[PDB]
Every structure is written in C-alpha cells, then in structure tokens.
Amino acid sequence: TLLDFPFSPRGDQLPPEIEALRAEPVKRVRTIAGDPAWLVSSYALCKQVLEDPRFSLKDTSAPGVPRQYALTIPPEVVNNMGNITGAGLRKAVLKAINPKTDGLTDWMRAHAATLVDDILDYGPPVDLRGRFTNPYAEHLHCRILGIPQADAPRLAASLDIAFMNSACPITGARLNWDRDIAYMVDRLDDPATTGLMAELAALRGNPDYDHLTDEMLATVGVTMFGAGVISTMGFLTMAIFSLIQHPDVWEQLRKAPEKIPAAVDELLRVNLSIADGLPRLALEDVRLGDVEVKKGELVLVLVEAANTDPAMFPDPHTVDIDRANAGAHLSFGGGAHYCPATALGKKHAEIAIEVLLERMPGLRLAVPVEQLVWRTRFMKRIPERLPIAW
Ligand code: HEM
C-alpha cells in the first residue's frame, strides 16, 4: 500500500526517504492513525499550504476526519490561539510571551548563568537536557505564567505523554489533563500567583468576561506551558546537538558572538527536532503542484524537507550562519497560524548559546553519537539524555 509517515525518530541526520520525495513533492502517505494524507515536501508548496485559507488547522480536530495521530487534548483546543483571541485574552497572552515584558530577557540571561554554573560545579559529564534545556524551558514558562518555579516538575512530567504521536487514545493523557487543569484553577485564587495567570484571574467579575470559566482560564495556562516548554526545550536541545555535530560553527560563534542571532535562524532551518507534519484539512478541491487534493483530505507540511529545498536554500545541507535567507525557514510555520512567540523562542535560544559559549567553550558530546537514545512516537525528535563533557 502507501509509504508510511513518519520515517525515523533518529535526529542525527535527515531521513533517507526525503531524497525520493523531491520527484513527488505532494505524495500520498499512511499516517500513524492509519489514515491517508498528502505529504508536501517542496518549499514553494509548503509555503502555499501555510498561507492559503483553503487549508484549515481548526478542521483537523473535527470528528470523523483523517488524522495524523490521536488527540491527547479535548478537540476544541486544536484551535487554542483562536479560542484565546475570541475570548478577549489575546492582549494578556501576547504581553506575557513578549521578551521585553517585566525584564524577561534579563531574567533568561541571569537564570541561564545560574543553571550552567550549577553544572560546572558538578563537573563532567552531565545530561544537558535534564540539567539545562529542561529547567531553562520549564522555568521560563513558570515565570511567564506567574506560578512557582518549584512546581515545574509536576507540570513537565505530563509532557512525555501529552506530545506522544499514537495510533490510539492514551488513558494517561486525560488523567494528566484533568490534574494540570485542577492545579491551574487553584493558581487563579492563590494570593502568590503573578504573571499571566494573575492577569487572567483579574478579568473574572469584569462584566465583559462573565463567559470565561475557571476551567477556560486554566486551559490557557496548561496549553501555554505544554506547547511553550516542548517547543523551546525540543528546539534548543537539537540546536545545541547541531552545534556539537558542526564544531566549525561552534568555533565561528566563540570568535563572533554578535553572529548568534543569525546563527539561531540557520539552526531553526537545519535542526531535526520536528518529528511530525504541520496538519491542514482541505476546505475545498485545490490543485497543489501536480495533485488534485479533494475537500476533506489531510495535508502534512514537512518542514525539514521544505527547509532543505535546494530551489530555496542552495547548498541546503551546509550550516552557513551568514546564509542571507536563513530567516525564511518554515520552523515557526507561516500564514494565519505563524508561531506568535517567535521573538521569545529566538531570544531564549540566543541567550542559552551565548551563556554556554562564554562559560563552557569546550562543550562536546560525552558519548559516541550512536549511544544517544532517540524518543520514539513523539511530536519531537529528542535524545532522552544529551551527555556532554568539557
Ligand atoms: C522556541 C521554539 C518554538 C518553535 C520552534 C515553535 C514552532 C511552532 C510552529 C511550527 C507552530 C505552527 C504549527 C502549525 O502551523 O500547525 C507554532 C504555533 C504556536 N506556537 Fe510556537 N514555537 C516555539 C515557541 C513557542 C512558545 C514559547 C510558545 C509559548 C506560549 C508557543 C506557542 C504557540 C502557539 C499558541 C501556537 C499556535 C498558533 C496558532 O494556532 O495561531 N510557541 N509554533
């Protein structure tokens, strides 16, 4: 029957399957859920799908439609950012994730210094994921949300199930969802709560927002923490791994730290942290390249193939931190559903790389690359541990 998608959980190299997709930039695949989908792999056609309102994100959660994998979340939260905007909270949300809000940029530089010094004090080797990228990501999201740093562990423990890419519903996902919601409701009335959750609590009783239940405000906190932490931890872990795989680039940034912002664009382009496709349901019959896509069919945007399309990025496998169009990568999506937290994502990664170059310039892998354990059937490619020495 059909070519199975996805291809490999290994994040050390592009799956070999990508090369054969170049002759068939729209190809029918069988998904994890066992459903047909169109896998789109050229930069031009991926951009077209992301920018065209005939390709719906919201409709991928409708009942009975072809799926990539099973939902771990209630259906209505697939269009989270739209339910957020619709409810009048967009302003509060966009403020909390702005890296210029309440000294957030200064806090990230300061806290990254603390986490790396704690690692330096213990000596090598350490698991960089467990001891740096996890807490750096989780603590950022505790600060944004206004909840205690000490609660990061209970909320992060959910994400190993929440972002699974499973053929079947997961009983653990519903139990974790209900527990994290109940926790976030408790934070609304907690006198200690600050940040986004304190601003969301304050809207209650404001006549305009009588439609906003405690569960609905709690949904904003839970989904922001989950999406934000898995994305920042996933990307940053694999951006550092890419710098370990390209020591010449690590060395360019040691001598030229002013190039770090541009280097993060080029790492967004080549990193292999995305293990799935960006899903869209066709609202209408659309010709996409050579393929007549039918109304109600599932389309998957393959970011890692788009970002290495030589038509758009000549010499695509070269990591060039001076690449003029590095910024045109699809790793933050595009069109109506473009990541709203790109300023924070970039700044978070820039600062971590800056602090590691300054305080741990001899950073290297502590194990043979083949001894990494790649997480299977998960939305991200990540090594369970990233053992490093210096
Ligand atoms: C740091 C690296 C990050 C990466 C690589 C990343 C990547 C992405 C991508 C690819 C999408 C588009 C999904 C699609 O088109 O179907 C997206 C959307 C989104 N991201 Fe990010 N993201 C990052 C950080 C964050 C953070 C820190 C937050 C914090 C709250 C966040 C919240 C969201 C939300 C709510 C959406 C949905 C947008 C919508 O439906 O309009 N992201 N992200």
Side-chain angles (χ1 to χ4, degrees), residues 54-57 59-86:
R54 288 128 127 189
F55 297 101
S56 181
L57 180 56
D59 287 59
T60 64
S61 86
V65 303
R67 293 168 294 144
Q68 196 178 188
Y69 46 71
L71 284 182
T72 63
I73 214 173
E76 323 296 282
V77 183
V78 155
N79 203 44
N80 185 38
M81 200 62 237
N83 280 322
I84 282 169
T85 308

PDB file of all heavy atoms in Angstrom, residues 54-86, unseen atoms left out:
ATOM      1  N   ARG A  54      -7.863  27.933   2.263  1.00  0.00           N
ATOM      2  CA  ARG A  54      -8.475  26.634   1.880  1.00  0.00           C
ATOM      3  C   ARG A  54      -7.873  25.488   2.705  1.00  0.00           C
ATOM      4  O   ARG A  54      -8.498  24.411   2.712  1.00  0.00           O
ATOM      5  CB  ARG A  54      -8.254  26.294   0.406  1.00  0.00           C
ATOM      6  CG  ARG A  54      -9.047  27.128  -0.595  1.00  0.00           C
ATOM      7  CD  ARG A  54      -7.943  27.587  -1.520  1.00  0.00           C
ATOM      8  NE  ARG A  54      -8.192  27.303  -2.897  1.00  0.00           N
ATOM      9  CZ  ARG A  54      -7.302  27.462  -3.866  1.00  0.00           C
ATOM     10  NH1 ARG A  54      -6.075  27.876  -3.607  1.00  0.00           N
ATOM     11  NH2 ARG A  54      -7.672  27.186  -5.100  1.00  0.00           N
ATOM     12  N   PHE A  55      -6.695  25.664   3.319  1.00  0.00           N
ATOM     13  CA  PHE A  55      -6.059  24.622   4.172  1.00  0.00           C
ATOM     14  C   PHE A  55      -6.252  25.019   5.645  1.00  0.00           C
ATOM     15  O   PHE A  55      -5.551  25.941   6.105  1.00  0.00           O
ATOM     16  CB  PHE A  55      -4.598  24.419   3.769  1.00  0.00           C
ATOM     17  CG  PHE A  55      -4.440  23.917   2.359  1.00  0.00           C
ATOM     18  CD1 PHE A  55      -4.085  24.782   1.333  1.00  0.00           C
ATOM     19  CD2 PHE A  55      -4.692  22.590   2.043  1.00  0.00           C
ATOM     20  CE1 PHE A  55      -3.958  24.325   0.030  1.00  0.00           C
ATOM     21  CE2 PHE A  55      -4.577  22.137   0.734  1.00  0.00           C
ATOM     22  CZ  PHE A  55      -4.215  23.004  -0.271  1.00  0.00           C
ATOM     23  N   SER A  56      -7.181  24.352   6.345  1.00  0.00           N
ATOM     24  CA  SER A  56      -7.650  24.712   7.711  1.00  0.00           C
ATOM     25  C   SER A  56      -6.907  23.902   8.776  1.00  0.00           C
ATOM     26  O   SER A  56      -6.870  22.672   8.654  1.00  0.00           O
ATOM     27  CB  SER A  56      -9.126  24.488   7.877  1.00  0.00           C
ATOM     28  OG  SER A  56      -9.547  24.863   9.184  1.00  0.00           O
ATOM     29  N   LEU A  57      -6.381  24.592   9.792  1.00  0.00           N
ATOM     30  CA  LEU A  57      -5.868  23.958  11.032  1.00  0.00           C
ATOM     31  C   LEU A  57      -7.034  23.509  11.922  1.00  0.00           C
ATOM     32  O   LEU A  57      -6.990  22.349  12.363  1.00  0.00           O
ATOM     33  CB  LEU A  57      -4.978  24.934  11.804  1.00  0.00           C
ATOM     34  CG  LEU A  57      -4.410  24.347  13.093  1.00  0.00           C
ATOM     35  CD1 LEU A  57      -3.650  23.055  12.808  1.00  0.00           C
ATOM     36  CD2 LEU A  57      -3.515  25.355  13.782  1.00  0.00           C
ATOM     37  N   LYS A  58      -8.001  24.392  12.190  1.00  0.00           N
ATOM     38  CA  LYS A  58      -9.179  24.121  13.058  1.00  0.00           C
ATOM     39  C   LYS A  58      -9.843  22.801  12.630  1.00  0.00           C
ATOM     40  O   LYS A  58     -10.135  21.974  13.511  1.00  0.00           O
ATOM     41  CB  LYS A  58     -10.126  25.330  13.032  1.00  0.00           C
ATOM     42  CG  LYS A  58     -11.462  25.195  13.756  1.00  0.00           C
ATOM     43  N   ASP A  59     -10.060  22.579  11.328  1.00  0.00           N
ATOM     44  CA  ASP A  59     -10.887  21.450  10.829  1.00  0.00           C
ATOM     45  C   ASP A  59     -10.126  20.123  10.990  1.00  0.00           C
ATOM     46  O   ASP A  59     -10.762  19.077  10.855  1.00  0.00           O
ATOM     47  CB  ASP A  59     -11.386  21.698   9.397  1.00  0.00           C
ATOM     48  CG  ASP A  59     -12.484  22.748   9.252  1.00  0.00           C
ATOM     49  OD1 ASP A  59     -12.257  23.904   9.630  1.00  0.00           O
ATOM     50  OD2 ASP A  59     -13.563  22.421   8.746  1.00  0.00           O
ATOM     51  N   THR A  60      -8.831  20.105  11.309  1.00  0.00           N
ATOM     52  CA  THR A  60      -8.085  18.834  11.556  1.00  0.00           C
ATOM     53  C   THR A  60      -8.578  18.122  12.828  1.00  0.00           C
ATOM     54  O   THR A  60      -8.303  16.909  12.950  1.00  0.00           O
ATOM     55  CB  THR A  60      -6.564  19.015  11.631  1.00  0.00           C
ATOM     56  OG1 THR A  60      -6.250  19.847  12.754  1.00  0.00           O
ATOM     57  CG2 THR A  60      -5.992  19.565  10.342  1.00  0.00           C
ATOM     58  N   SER A  61      -9.286  18.823  13.720  1.00  0.00           N
ATOM     59  CA  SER A  61      -9.818  18.285  15.001  1.00  0.00           C
ATOM     60  C   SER A  61     -11.310  17.939  14.916  1.00  0.00           C
ATOM     61  O   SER A  61     -11.871  17.496  15.946  1.00  0.00           O
ATOM     62  CB  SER A  61      -9.591  19.287  16.084  1.00  0.00           C
ATOM     63  OG  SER A  61     -10.665  20.204  16.096  1.00  0.00           O
ATOM     64  N   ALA A  62     -11.954  18.155  13.765  1.00  0.00           N
ATOM     65  CA  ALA A  62     -13.385  17.848  13.583  1.00  0.00           C
ATOM     66  C   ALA A  62     -13.562  16.335  13.700  1.00  0.00           C
ATOM     67  O   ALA A  62     -12.639  15.569  13.431  1.00  0.00           O
ATOM     68  CB  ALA A  62     -13.891  18.405  12.268  1.00  0.00           C
ATOM     69  N   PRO A  63     -14.753  15.840  14.097  1.00  0.00           N
ATOM     70  CA  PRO A  63     -14.935  14.406  14.287  1.00  0.00           C
ATOM     71  C   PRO A  63     -15.049  13.710  12.918  1.00  0.00           C
ATOM     72  O   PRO A  63     -15.662  14.257  12.001  1.00  0.00           O
ATOM     73  CB  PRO A  63     -16.206  14.284  15.148  1.00  0.00           C
ATOM     74  CG  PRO A  63     -16.742  15.702  15.311  1.00  0.00           C
ATOM     75  CD  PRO A  63     -15.994  16.593  14.336  1.00  0.00           C
ATOM     76  N   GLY A  64     -14.417  12.539  12.809  1.00  0.00           N
ATOM     77  CA  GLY A  64     -14.505  11.652  11.635  1.00  0.00           C
ATOM     78  C   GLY A  64     -13.503  11.990  10.543  1.00  0.00           C
ATOM     79  O   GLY A  64     -13.495  11.246   9.548  1.00  0.00           O
ATOM     80  N   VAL A  65     -12.688  13.045  10.673  1.00  0.00           N
ATOM     81  CA  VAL A  65     -11.758  13.452   9.572  1.00  0.00           C
ATOM     82  C   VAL A  65     -10.524  12.556   9.628  1.00  0.00           C
ATOM     83  O   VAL A  65     -10.225  11.974  10.671  1.00  0.00           O
ATOM     84  CB  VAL A  65     -11.396  14.952   9.628  1.00  0.00           C
ATOM     85  CG1 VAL A  65     -12.634  15.840   9.575  1.00  0.00           C
ATOM     86  CG2 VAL A  65     -10.559  15.305  10.850  1.00  0.00           C
ATOM     87  N   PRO A  66      -9.767  12.409   8.517  1.00  0.00           N
ATOM     88  CA  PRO A  66      -8.473  11.731   8.561  1.00  0.00           C
ATOM     89  C   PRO A  66      -7.498  12.452   9.507  1.00  0.00           C
ATOM     90  O   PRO A  66      -7.441  13.659   9.500  1.00  0.00           O
ATOM     91  CB  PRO A  66      -7.945  11.751   7.119  1.00  0.00           C
ATOM     92  CG  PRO A  66      -8.807  12.778   6.386  1.00  0.00           C
ATOM     93  CD  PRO A  66     -10.111  12.861   7.157  1.00  0.00           C
ATOM     94  N   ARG A  67      -6.766  11.680  10.308  1.00  0.00           N
ATOM     95  CA  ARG A  67      -5.866  12.214  11.363  1.00  0.00           C
ATOM     96  C   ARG A  67      -4.433  11.743  11.123  1.00  0.00           C
ATOM     97  O   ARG A  67      -4.247  10.646  10.572  1.00  0.00           O
ATOM     98  CB  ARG A  67      -6.293  11.723  12.747  1.00  0.00           C
ATOM     99  CG  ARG A  67      -7.631  12.265  13.220  1.00  0.00           C
ATOM    100  CD  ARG A  67      -8.055  11.480  14.447  1.00  0.00           C
ATOM    101  NE  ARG A  67      -8.330  10.088  14.087  1.00  0.00           N
ATOM    102  CZ  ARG A  67      -8.079   9.015  14.838  1.00  0.00           C
ATOM    103  NH1 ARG A  67      -7.527   9.123  16.039  1.00  0.00           N
ATOM    104  NH2 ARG A  67      -8.387   7.817  14.372  1.00  0.00           N
ATOM    105  N   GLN A  68      -3.469  12.526  11.595  1.00  0.00           N
ATOM    106  CA  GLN A  68      -2.031  12.146  11.615  1.00  0.00           C
ATOM    107  C   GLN A  68      -1.824  11.110  12.729  1.00  0.00           C
ATOM    108  O   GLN A  68      -1.170  10.065  12.502  1.00  0.00           O
ATOM    109  CB  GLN A  68      -1.183  13.405  11.806  1.00  0.00           C
ATOM    110  CG  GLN A  68       0.272  13.179  11.457  1.00  0.00           C
ATOM    111  CD  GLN A  68       1.143  14.400  11.589  1.00  0.00           C
ATOM    112  OE1 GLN A  68       2.302  14.354  11.190  1.00  0.00           O
ATOM    113  NE2 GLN A  68       0.595  15.493  12.099  1.00  0.00           N
ATOM    114  N   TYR A  69      -2.426  11.381  13.887  1.00  0.00           N
ATOM    115  CA  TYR A  69      -2.341  10.579  15.133  1.00  0.00           C
ATOM    116  C   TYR A  69      -3.476  11.036  16.058  1.00  0.00           C
ATOM    117  O   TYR A  69      -4.201  11.982  15.723  1.00  0.00           O
ATOM    118  CB  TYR A  69      -0.938  10.698  15.740  1.00  0.00           C
ATOM    119  CG  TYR A  69      -0.389  12.099  15.795  1.00  0.00           C
ATOM    120  CD1 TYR A  69      -0.908  13.023  16.689  1.00  0.00           C
ATOM    121  CD2 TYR A  69       0.644  12.501  14.964  1.00  0.00           C
ATOM    122  CE1 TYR A  69      -0.436  14.322  16.756  1.00  0.00           C
ATOM    123  CE2 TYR A  69       1.127  13.799  15.014  1.00  0.00           C
ATOM    124  CZ  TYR A  69       0.588  14.707  15.913  1.00  0.00           C
ATOM    125  OH  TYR A  69       1.073  15.981  16.008  1.00  0.00           O
ATOM    126  N   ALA A  70      -3.652  10.353  17.179  1.00  0.00           N
ATOM    127  CA  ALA A  70      -4.797  10.540  18.091  1.00  0.00           C
ATOM    128  C   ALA A  70      -4.571  11.829  18.878  1.00  0.00           C
ATOM    129  O   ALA A  70      -3.387  12.118  19.210  1.00  0.00           O
ATOM    130  CB  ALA A  70      -4.929   9.345  19.005  1.00  0.00           C
ATOM    131  N   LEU A  71      -5.656  12.562  19.153  1.00  0.00           N
ATOM    132  CA  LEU A  71      -5.623  13.754  20.041  1.00  0.00           C
ATOM    133  C   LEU A  71      -5.283  13.294  21.458  1.00  0.00           C
ATOM    134  O   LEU A  71      -5.763  12.236  21.881  1.00  0.00           O
ATOM    135  CB  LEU A  71      -6.975  14.472  20.051  1.00  0.00           C
ATOM    136  CG  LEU A  71      -7.305  15.323  18.828  1.00  0.00           C
ATOM    137  CD1 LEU A  71      -8.655  15.988  19.048  1.00  0.00           C
ATOM    138  CD2 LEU A  71      -6.235  16.372  18.544  1.00  0.00           C
ATOM    139  N   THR A  72      -4.494  14.079  22.177  1.00  0.00           N
ATOM    140  CA  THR A  72      -4.217  13.888  23.623  1.00  0.00           C
ATOM    141  C   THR A  72      -4.942  14.973  24.416  1.00  0.00           C
ATOM    142  O   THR A  72      -4.853  14.954  25.642  1.00  0.00           O
ATOM    143  CB  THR A  72      -2.703  13.925  23.842  1.00  0.00           C
ATOM    144  OG1 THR A  72      -2.245  15.227  23.459  1.00  0.00           O
ATOM    145  CG2 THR A  72      -1.996  12.863  23.023  1.00  0.00           C
ATOM    146  N   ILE A  73      -5.660  15.854  23.723  1.00  0.00           N
ATOM    147  CA  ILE A  73      -6.250  17.121  24.247  1.00  0.00           C
ATOM    148  C   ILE A  73      -7.729  17.120  23.856  1.00  0.00           C
ATOM    149  O   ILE A  73      -8.084  16.445  22.896  1.00  0.00           O
ATOM    150  CB  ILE A  73      -5.377  18.240  23.631  1.00  0.00           C
ATOM    151  CG1 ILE A  73      -5.196  19.452  24.541  1.00  0.00           C
ATOM    152  CG2 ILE A  73      -5.806  18.666  22.232  1.00  0.00           C
ATOM    153  CD1 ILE A  73      -4.210  20.448  23.967  1.00  0.00           C
ATOM    154  N   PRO A  74      -8.674  17.794  24.556  1.00  0.00           N
ATOM    155  CA  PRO A  74     -10.036  17.942  24.017  1.00  0.00           C
ATOM    156  C   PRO A  74     -10.027  18.565  22.613  1.00  0.00           C
ATOM    157  O   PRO A  74      -9.123  19.329  22.260  1.00  0.00           O
ATOM    158  CB  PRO A  74     -10.815  18.810  25.022  1.00  0.00           C
ATOM    159  CG  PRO A  74      -9.853  19.082  26.178  1.00  0.00           C
ATOM    160  CD  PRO A  74      -8.537  18.371  25.899  1.00  0.00           C
ATOM    161  N   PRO A  75     -11.008  18.243  21.736  1.00  0.00           N
ATOM    162  CA  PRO A  75     -10.947  18.692  20.340  1.00  0.00           C
ATOM    163  C   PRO A  75     -10.844  20.218  20.147  1.00  0.00           C
ATOM    164  O   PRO A  75     -10.089  20.607  19.261  1.00  0.00           O
ATOM    165  CB  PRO A  75     -12.255  18.166  19.715  1.00  0.00           C
ATOM    166  CG  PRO A  75     -12.713  17.057  20.651  1.00  0.00           C
ATOM    167  CD  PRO A  75     -12.214  17.444  22.027  1.00  0.00           C
ATOM    168  N   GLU A  76     -11.545  21.006  20.980  1.00  0.00           N
ATOM    169  CA  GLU A  76     -11.722  22.484  20.862  1.00  0.00           C
ATOM    170  C   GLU A  76     -10.383  23.219  21.050  1.00  0.00           C
ATOM    171  O   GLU A  76     -10.282  24.402  20.668  1.00  0.00           O
ATOM    172  CB  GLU A  76     -12.704  23.041  21.902  1.00  0.00           C
ATOM    173  CG  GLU A  76     -13.897  22.155  22.236  1.00  0.00           C
ATOM    174  CD  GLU A  76     -14.895  21.878  21.120  1.00  0.00           C
ATOM    175  OE1 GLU A  76     -15.726  22.765  20.841  1.00  0.00           O
ATOM    176  OE2 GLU A  76     -14.853  20.768  20.544  1.00  0.00           O
ATOM    177  N   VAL A  77      -9.373  22.568  21.627  1.00  0.00           N
ATOM    178  CA  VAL A  77      -8.071  23.213  21.983  1.00  0.00           C
ATOM    179  C   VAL A  77      -7.077  23.091  20.809  1.00  0.00           C
ATOM    180  O   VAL A  77      -5.994  23.710  20.887  1.00  0.00           O
ATOM    181  CB  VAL A  77      -7.557  22.608  23.305  1.00  0.00           C
ATOM    182  CG1 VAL A  77      -6.271  23.259  23.800  1.00  0.00           C
ATOM    183  CG2 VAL A  77      -8.631  22.657  24.386  1.00  0.00           C
ATOM    184  N   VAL A  78      -7.402  22.362  19.731  1.00  0.00           N
ATOM    185  CA  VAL A  78      -6.550  22.350  18.497  1.00  0.00           C
ATOM    186  C   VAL A  78      -6.454  23.787  17.949  1.00  0.00           C
ATOM    187  O   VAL A  78      -5.345  24.167  17.489  1.00  0.00           O
ATOM    188  CB  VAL A  78      -7.030  21.327  17.440  1.00  0.00           C
ATOM    189  CG1 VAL A  78      -6.620  21.695  16.014  1.00  0.00           C
ATOM    190  CG2 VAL A  78      -6.537  19.925  17.782  1.00  0.00           C
ATOM    191  N   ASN A  79      -7.544  24.561  18.023  1.00  0.00           N
ATOM    192  CA  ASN A  79      -7.591  25.991  17.606  1.00  0.00           C
ATOM    193  C   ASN A  79      -7.456  26.891  18.844  1.00  0.00           C
ATOM    194  O   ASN A  79      -8.250  27.852  18.971  1.00  0.00           O
ATOM    195  CB  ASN A  79      -8.868  26.275  16.809  1.00  0.00           C
ATOM    196  CG  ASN A  79      -8.760  27.491  15.910  1.00  0.00           C
ATOM    197  OD1 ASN A  79      -7.755  27.685  15.225  1.00  0.00           O
ATOM    198  ND2 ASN A  79      -9.805  28.302  15.890  1.00  0.00           N
ATOM    199  N   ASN A  80      -6.477  26.595  19.710  1.00  0.00           N
ATOM    200  CA  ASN A  80      -6.260  27.235  21.040  1.00  0.00           C
ATOM    201  C   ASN A  80      -6.110  28.758  20.894  1.00  0.00           C
ATOM    202  O   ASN A  80      -6.835  29.481  21.614  1.00  0.00           O
ATOM    203  CB  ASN A  80      -5.050  26.645  21.784  1.00  0.00           C
ATOM    204  CG  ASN A  80      -4.880  27.207  23.182  1.00  0.00           C
ATOM    205  OD1 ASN A  80      -5.873  27.442  23.871  1.00  0.00           O
ATOM    206  ND2 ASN A  80      -3.640  27.446  23.597  1.00  0.00           N
ATOM    207  N   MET A  81      -5.213  29.215  20.009  1.00  0.00           N
ATOM    208  CA  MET A  81      -4.841  30.649  19.854  1.00  0.00           C
ATOM    209  C   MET A  81      -6.057  31.442  19.362  1.00  0.00           C
ATOM    210  O   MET A  81      -6.217  32.598  19.798  1.00  0.00           O
ATOM    211  CB  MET A  81      -3.649  30.837  18.906  1.00  0.00           C
ATOM    212  CG  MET A  81      -2.938  32.174  19.084  1.00  0.00           C
ATOM    213  SD  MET A  81      -2.184  32.431  20.729  1.00  0.00           S
ATOM    214  CE  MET A  81      -3.009  33.952  21.196  1.00  0.00           C
ATOM    215  N   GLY A  82      -6.903  30.831  18.526  1.00  0.00           N
ATOM    216  CA  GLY A  82      -8.177  31.413  18.061  1.00  0.00           C
ATOM    217  C   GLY A  82      -9.239  31.491  19.153  1.00  0.00           C
ATOM    218  O   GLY A  82      -9.992  32.502  19.159  1.00  0.00           O
ATOM    219  N   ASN A  83      -9.348  30.466  20.017  1.00  0.00           N
ATOM    220  CA  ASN A  83     -10.304  30.438  21.166  1.00  0.00           C
ATOM    221  C   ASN A  83      -9.854  31.498  22.183  1.00  0.00           C
ATOM    222  O   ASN A  83     -10.728  32.164  22.804  1.00  0.00           O
ATOM    223  CB  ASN A  83     -10.406  29.070  21.854  1.00  0.00           C
ATOM    224  CG  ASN A  83     -11.286  28.055  21.152  1.00  0.00           C
ATOM    225  OD1 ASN A  83     -12.339  28.376  20.604  1.00  0.00           O
ATOM    226  ND2 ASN A  83     -10.860  26.804  21.188  1.00  0.00           N
ATOM    227  N   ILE A  84      -8.527  31.621  22.336  1.00  0.00           N
ATOM    228  CA  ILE A  84      -7.848  32.663  23.163  1.00  0.00           C
ATOM    229  C   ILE A  84      -8.232  34.044  22.615  1.00  0.00           C
ATOM    230  O   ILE A  84      -8.813  34.829  23.393  1.00  0.00           O
ATOM    231  CB  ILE A  84      -6.323  32.435  23.226  1.00  0.00           C
ATOM    232  CG1 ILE A  84      -5.981  31.311  24.208  1.00  0.00           C
ATOM    233  CG2 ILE A  84      -5.588  33.728  23.562  1.00  0.00           C
ATOM    234  CD1 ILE A  84      -4.544  30.833  24.144  1.00  0.00           C
ATOM    235  N   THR A  85      -7.955  34.337  21.340  1.00  0.00           N
ATOM    236  CA  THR A  85      -8.309  35.644  20.717  1.00  0.00           C
ATOM    237  C   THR A  85      -9.824  35.896  20.835  1.00  0.00           C
ATOM    238  O   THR A  85     -10.204  37.006  21.263  1.00  0.00           O
ATOM    239  CB  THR A  85      -7.811  35.736  19.268  1.00  0.00           C
ATOM    240  OG1 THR A  85      -6.423  35.401  19.261  1.00  0.00           O
ATOM    241  CG2 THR A  85      -8.006  37.111  18.666  1.00  0.00           C
ATOM    242  N   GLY A  86     -10.656  34.914  20.474  1.00  0.00           N
ATOM    243  CA  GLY A  86     -12.131  35.010  20.505  1.00  0.00           C
ATOM    244  C   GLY A  86     -12.664  35.413  21.870  1.00  0.00           C
ATOM    245  O   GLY A  86     -13.703  36.084  21.928  1.00  0.00           O
TER     246      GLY A  86
END
